[PDB]
Design a protein around this ligand. Structure first.
Ligand SMILES: O=c1ccn([C@H]2O[C@@H](COP(=O)(O)O)[C@H](O)[C@@H]2O)c(=O)[nH]1
Length: 121
């Protein structure tokens, strides 16, 4: 069905813009609360082209020890969503935290595009 690149865009891209309720709404609408409350998830508020370009930027080790992760040279506008301590599926609750940080994504395929959000720094 959904490609890895498409799933990345679904789980991590929001070029369209946050408020205190952003994560509650967004995690729901992007289907990250379907089977489980996804504990941690980041949305990137840059253009797709800008985020895709990260796959030709600074090559860094992935957290899992693979070598196909890439760090943005520039900081990017992001929102971190983190499940609260009182969150209970299926009413998943998140704290919304905006920041401007370098992103690290894993890239794969031809074309070579982001498939996983690894970290922000
Ligand atoms: O800063 C972070 C750290 C992890 N993640 C999430 O991204 C997950 C990696 O899975 P994927 O990007 O393939 O959905 C990771 O395990 C965590 O759930 C973020 O979005 N941002």
């Amino acid at each position: 069905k959904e490609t890895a690149a498409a799933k990345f865009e679904r789980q991590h891209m929001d070029s369209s813009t946050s408020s205190s309720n952003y994560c509650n709404q967004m995690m729901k609408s992007r289907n990250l609360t379907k089977d489980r409350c996804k504990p941690v998830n980041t949305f990137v508020h840059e253009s797709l082209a800008d985020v895709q370009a990260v796959c030709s930027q600074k090559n860094v080790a992935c957290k899992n020890g693979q070598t196909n992760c890439y760090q943005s040279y520039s900081t990017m506008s992001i929102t971190d969503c983190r499940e609260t301590g009182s969150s209970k599926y299926p009413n998943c609750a998140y704290k919304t935290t905006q920041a401007n940080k370098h992103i690290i994504v894993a890239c794969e395929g031809n074309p070579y595009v982001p498939v996983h959000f690894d970290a922000s720094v």
